[PDB]
Design a protein around this ligand. Structure first.
Ligand SMILES: [Mg+2]
Ligand SMILES: [Mg+2]
Ligand SMILES: [Mg+2]
Ligand SMILES: [Mg+2]
Ligand SMILES: [Mg+2]
Ligand SMILES: [Mg+2]
Ligand SMILES: [Mg+2]
Ligand SMILES: [Mg+2]
Ligand SMILES: [Mg+2]
Ligand SMILES: [Mg+2]
Lengths: 55, 106, 14, 117, 88
RNA sequence: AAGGCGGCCCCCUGGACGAAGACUGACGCUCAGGUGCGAAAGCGUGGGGAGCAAACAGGAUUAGAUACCCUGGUAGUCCACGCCGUAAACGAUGUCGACUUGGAGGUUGUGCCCUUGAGGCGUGGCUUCCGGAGCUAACGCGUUAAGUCGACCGCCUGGGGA
């Protein structure tokens, strides 16, 4: 249902340094949290979100 | 039969060779009973971080429904060609026909 | 404790 | 003798020593000053006051280029992280950018053994 | 185990109808073709001892199913052992 | 199954669980020998080599420093091919089934419902912390039992010698 292409949803789920916010802060479901984790790692290979705030 | 989403990016200096690579790879898939569901050209796109010392990468998004014959050959000619700098395939759950959010916003 | 265990070997008297 | 007007401060902050280095935006070094040669040795070297005079002395050797807008790149978990930035403003500069550039490996190499005391 | 066309065919091969899928002779054929499917896999993948546990489970499962038909009706037992190439 | 297992993607492949029915008809449980898997170190052959690091080199420490601490550093750590089969290999609880008040949760499904919100009501699989009766030497366990019972197997008989 969730997908890696809608990066605006992924912008709400990362930090300014590209770090993945856990479900403790956002309060999302744990089923989506494993799905959101692998969805960002797909976008991390395709140069869609930065790794760190270094570059 | 499996359902693949094929993501491959093109070197920005050879962006005019993109419609040649579309129809040459299509005839090999559809001849061996391979379906097609999505073929969307995006043009150049700004990178989140630089790769191969370049910027403004060309993006082509695909959905190919085809058996395991083309999955052997097409990943080798991506590594054989120097225009494709990144190749990525993935298995999906079903044959899907839906526009990307990049096309729906641009 | 099992009776069927003591069929194979009885209780070893020291 | 030359005009750049764009400073970059790759400052280092280790547990033993704090190193202030001014450079440009294109890697060409402009000057450095360490807390070891600032009259601070050993336990006196690992003091935040040693980073207060190291930033000011390194700034005194880069005013020949007429630098007014500088960038601060903080590298290291060592003490003195605050005393070296306030010393840049006391040297008559316009502080623009402050950025943590501390290297964080993604479990690349194996760390050394513990130091049990 | 297999695909839908390979599963439903062998049930129709050895069963009396399409509903004859729970019997013992069908269950032997599901394990016989699967071990025959895994002949070329474990030759190349001898370091895969975790999938070997699933292989040896189906070997022990088929042996227990051959012992049930052998102790009840040896007429159907002698048919299936040569029709699938058993007894070695 | 356990030791264990963590970038992403493809290929091959294993089990577990849920829903709706259909189907075989006790086909089952258990396990001496036997069989296979099995942390890391180490061993054999051939590669590989960053970082870490036995032995060892050097400097402090000290009565001496062999260790601690620091600067280096071989074997090893890496891969293929074998062998070795030992651990505080621990949930310090062998496997299987049946029942016996319950909560706070987590994970994973499914069924129904002004869908009137990711909700309401149930209902299975997995898992943790509390706790009644009961049990236990206490500690604690307590519907995942160390409660009440059955099926089978392993093992112990003062400490040391060992
Ligand atoms: Mg499966
Ligand atoms: Mg009947
Ligand atoms: Mg040796
Ligand atoms: Mg040492
Ligand atoms: Mg060796
Ligand atoms: Mg032992
Ligand atoms: Mg414990
Ligand atoms: Mg009580
Ligand atoms: Mg309790
Ligand atoms: Mg004795």
């Amino acid at each position: 249902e969730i997908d890696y292409k809608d990066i605006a949803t992924l912008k709400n789920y990362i930090t300014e340094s590209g770090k993945i916010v856990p479900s403790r802060i956002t309060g999302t479901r744990a089923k989506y949290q494993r799905q959101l984790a692998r969805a960002i790692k797909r976008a991390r290979y395709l140069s869609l979100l930065p790794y760190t705030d270094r570059h | 039969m499996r359902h693949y989403e094929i993501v491959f990016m093109v070197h920005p200096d050879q962006s005019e060779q993109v419609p040649g690579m579309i129809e040459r790879y299509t005839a090999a898939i559809t001849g061996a009973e391979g379906k097609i569901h999505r073929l969307e050209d995006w043009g150049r796109r700004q990178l989140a971080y630089p790769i191969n010392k370049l910027h403004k990468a060309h993006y082509v998004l695909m959905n190919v429904e085809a058996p395991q014959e083309v999955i052997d050959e097409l990943e080798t000619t991506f590594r054989f060609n120097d225009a494709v700098i990144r190749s990525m395939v993935m298995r999906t759950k079903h044959a899907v026909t839906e526009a990307s959010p990049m096309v729906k916003a641009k | 404790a099992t009776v069927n265990q003591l069929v194979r070997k009885p209780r070893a008297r020291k | 003798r030359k005009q750049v007007s764009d400073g970059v401060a790759h400052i280092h902050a280790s547990f033993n020593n704090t190193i202030v280095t001014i450079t440009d935006r294109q890697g060409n070094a402009l000057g450095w000053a360490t807390a070891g040669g600032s009259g601070f040795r050993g336990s006196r070297k690992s003091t935040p006051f040693a980073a207060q005079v190291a930033a000011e002395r390194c700034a005194d050797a880069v005013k020949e280029y007429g630098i007014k807008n500088l960038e601060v790149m903080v590298k290291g978990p060592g003490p003195g992280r605050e005393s070296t930035i306030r010393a840049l403003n006391a040297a008559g500069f316009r502080i623009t950018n402050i950025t943590d550039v501390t290297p964080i490996p993604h479990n690349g190499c194996r760390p050394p053994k513990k130091r049990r005391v | 185990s297999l695909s839908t066309e390979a599963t439903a065919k062998i049930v129709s091969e050895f069963g009396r109808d399409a509903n004859d899928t729970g019997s013992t002779e069908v269950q032997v054929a599901l394990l016989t073709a699967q071990i025959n499917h895994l002949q070329g896999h474990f030759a190349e993948h001898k370091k895969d001892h975790h999938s070997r546990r699933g292989l040896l489970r189906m070997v022990s499962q088929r042996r227990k199913l051959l012992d049930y038909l052998k102790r009840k009706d040896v007429a159907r037992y002698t048919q299936l052992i040569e029709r699938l190439g058993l007894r070695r």
